[PDB]
């Protein structure tokens, strides 16, 4: 790369719903990310939290017995 006119890019830290991401290698070492969904939080590790599909089923059971 050309000299000057550049960001430093240095080994860094990171935080999330997980714990730590040592990899990084970026400017501004040590970062606090809202939620790294890579550690296992969110969608991956298919939580499917707040599960759904009430719709028919819901009005079905409060109906079969009302």
């Amino acid at each position: 790369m050309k000299e000057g006119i550049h960001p430093k890019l240095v080994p860094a830290r990171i935080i999330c719903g997980c714990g730590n991401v040592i990899e990084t290698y970026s400017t501004k070492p040590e970062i606090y990310v809202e939620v790294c969904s890579k550690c296992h939080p969110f969608y991956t590790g298919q939580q499917r939290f707040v599960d759904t599909e009430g719709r028919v089923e819901r009005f079905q059971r409060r109906y079969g017995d009302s």
């Binding site: 999330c16 990084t24 290698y25 990310v33 939620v35 790294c36 969904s37 550690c39 969608y43």
Partner: peptide
């Protein structure tokens, strides 16, 4: 190299921070 360090954060941080995203 510089592509590698970039592609890594794209998977382990960025995309995760997308409103919605399935």
């Amino acid at each position: 190299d510089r592509m590698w360090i970039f592609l890594e954060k794209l998977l382990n941080v960025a995309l995760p921070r997308i409103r919605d995203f399935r």
